[PDB]
Design a protein around this ligand. Structure first.
Ligand code: ATP
Ligand code: ZN
Ligand code: ZN
Length: 613
């Protein structure tokens, strides 16, 4: 039966590469069914402007050694073995009953006003022709080369329609995962650093089909705060401090922000079944299509991944498994947020004495009743005590028993990161120490007496990333525009950091004022890209921090960067500032040599001197 569901995809591959197809070099796979291999060509960059603008950071290992990804077969195999070739154990019956109730409640709540609907060809095309199918990583669109000309060709859509017909017939032929490579470990403090993660691609057609059947979850903002209560989908990172500060404003215990150790390796068949309840929000064709996506591409997966073989040779392995997720899906962020809300509701019920460790193997009827009653009476309020974005969460429980409420959490395989399994969680009395979506947030006072809540994170990581250039095919122009994008992003979000204000300004002084920022500064669903512009950044700043800031009452425009605040020196240094050092002072004093050196490489252009201060 599982055999049956993957047969067609395997047969397609076995036939396309019948030439080199063989059955295995002692294959490494332990939890994945191995089908065979074939021969392939193995797969596997500094920003000059930012580099030149950041001389002191040449002495800092976090910056100089930074790498994003490893798409070699070696890196594919490493990440596959560490992160994908594992199986989370199913939770026991009581826990299942608690998650069953909890997810029934959450689905009823998310669907209270929003109605599910198909997304469309034209919606997808519009999505593709922009700031992207951002992160649902895109691409086999192999013969067009880019996604834009692929969606522009009627032949692409005929392929889509054919596979759509197969789905409607209960079969899947082409919808196959490719593990393109490894996203390296990201920096963080203990309990917050992200481990390496797999990078998944599928054919563009597969992405369309997924998007059509389930993309409404994203496109109609099912996980927005307004709809989900605990979610924050749609909000810029500049809203998130304010949201934490409102949560902090409620009466309760400390604030907790436990990460799961590798969330995407820890979702169980149970979590999938509860997610799959989405099917009953659906009717007719819509449901048929979504059912095919869930049953055939989410559950019965087929996966291609590279492996090093004999003579500096590379094979592609073909493997399958009755599985769950990994990301690489169009709705991975939405469903992670759903399941993680449910997870936090369960933990809150344990923390509030509704359920205990006696209940894991079996949930007594009396407790089932109390569970349902607690969700009915408290769900809507408890959800507002949370900020959940994917696997990132912050929660403010009623009281600090939450610290020890770990039985259901561990039984659900949602083991917390970098803390011993049964050690109570650490919570914070101060909302400004709480980490969330790679930031913490600081309330700072401006000269005019008004205050703002600004995002803050390790400066080395920011500088390190800006120094990276994805382009083999980036112009002098594209490099300077990307440097510009980073600089302007720092001006909108991290202006309060002295080195970043200074570095951003020097970069904007060095790059032609009429050049439009291009490229990508962040993968986060929370970076909205207000800095991708040639508009004067202070006006953008005013619009974001004053005008459209619903926590800003007095709408009085700020007129000069002079009146835009910095964090206290203590903070700045804490999060990696180089102020106070001889290196950074030499740097501030000689910056102009670097600027003019850039202006001299780029050539005769309209420039502006932004080092007024
Ligand atoms: N479940 C999730 N999956 C992927 N990204 C998430 C999830 N939840 C939140 N995020 C966002 O992604 C960021 C970190 O993981 P990611 O791989 O996206 O690197 P990144 O976001 O590009 O780094 P950065 O935040 O500087 O852009 C977090 O800051 C957060 O804003
Ligand atoms: Zn398919
Ligand atoms: Zn900070």
């Amino acid at each position: 039966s599982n055999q049956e569901k993957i047969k067609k995809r395997i047969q397609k591959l076995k036939e396309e590469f019948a030439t080199t197809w063989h059955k295995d070099p002692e294959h490494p796979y332990r939890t994945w069914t191995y089908h065979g291999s074939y021969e392939v060509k193995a797969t596997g960059l500094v920003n000059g402007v930012v580099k030149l603008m950041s001389k002191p950071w040449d002495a800092i290992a976090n910056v100089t050694t930074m790498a994003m990804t490893d798409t070699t077969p070696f890196g594919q195999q490493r990440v596959f073995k560490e992160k994908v070739d594992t199986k989370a154990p199913e939770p026991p019956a009581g826990v299942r009953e608690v998650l069953n109730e909890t997810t029934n409640w959450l689905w009823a709540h998310l669907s209270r006003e929003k109605r599910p609907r198909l997304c469309t060809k034209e919606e997808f095309i519009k999505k593709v022709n922009s700031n992207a199918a951002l992160g649902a990583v895109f691409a086999e669109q192999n013969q067009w080369s880019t996604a834009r000309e692929a969606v522009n060709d009627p032949r692409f859509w005929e392929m889509v329609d054919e596979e759509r017909e197969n789905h409607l017939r209960g079969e899947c032929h082409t919808c196959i995962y490719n593990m393109m490579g490894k996203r390296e470990k990201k920096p963080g403090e203990f309990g917050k650093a992200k481990g390496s993660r797999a990078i998944w691609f599928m054919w563009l057609g597969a992405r369309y089909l997924e998007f059509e059947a389930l993309g409404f979850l994203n496109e109609d903002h099912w996980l927005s705060r307004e709809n989900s209560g605990g979610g924050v989908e749609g909000s810029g990172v500049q809203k998130l401090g304010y949201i934490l500060r409102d949560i902090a404003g409620k009466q309760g215990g400390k604030m907790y922000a436990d990460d799961t150790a590798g969330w995407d390796t820890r979702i169980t068949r149970t979590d999938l079944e509860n997610e799959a309840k989405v099917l009953e929000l659906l009717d007719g064709e819509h449901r048929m299509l979504a059912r095919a996506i869930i049953e055939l591409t989410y559950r019965h997966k087929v996966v291609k991944v590279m492996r090093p073989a004999a003579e500096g040779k590379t094979v592609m392995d073909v493997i399958s498994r009755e599985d769950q997720r990994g990301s690489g899906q169009v709705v991975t962020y939405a469903l992670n947020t759903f399941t993680n809300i449910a997870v936090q509701l369960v933990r809150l019920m344990e923390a509030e004495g509704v359920i205990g460790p006696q209940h894991l193997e079996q949930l007594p009827r009396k407790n089932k009743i109390a569970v349902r009653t607690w969700l009915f009476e408290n769900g809507e309020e408890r959800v507002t005590r949370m900020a959940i974005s994917g696997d990132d969460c912050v929660v403010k429980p009623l009281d600090d028993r939450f610290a020890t409420a770990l039985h259901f959490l561990n039984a659900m395989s949602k083991v917390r990161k970098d803390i011993q399994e049964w050690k109570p969680s650490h919570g914070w009395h101060d909302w400004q120490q709480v980490p969330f979506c790679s930031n913490h947030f600081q309330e700072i006072v401006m000269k005019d007496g008004r205050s703002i809540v600004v995002p803050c994170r390790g400066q080395d990581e920011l500088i390190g990333r800006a120094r990276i250039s994805p382009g083999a095919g980036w112009n002098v122009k594209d490099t300077a525009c990307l440097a510009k994008a980073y600089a302007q992003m720092w001006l909108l979000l991290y202006f309060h950091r002295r080195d970043l204000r200074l570095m951003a300004n020097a970069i904007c002084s060095a790059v032609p004022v009429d050049w439009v920022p291009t490229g990508r500064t962040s993968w986060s669903i929370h970076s909205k890209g207000e800095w991708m512009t040639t508009e004067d950044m202070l006006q953008v700043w005013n619009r974001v921090w004053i005008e459209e800031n619903e926590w800003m009452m007095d709408k009085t425009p700020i007129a000069s960067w002079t009146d835009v605040p910095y964090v206290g020196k203590r903070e700045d240094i804490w999060c990696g500032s180089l102020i106070g050092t001889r290196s950074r002072a030499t740097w501030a004093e000689n910056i102009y040599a670097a600027i003019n050196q850039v202006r001299a490489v780029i050539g005769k252009e309209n420039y502006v001197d932004y080092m007024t201060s």
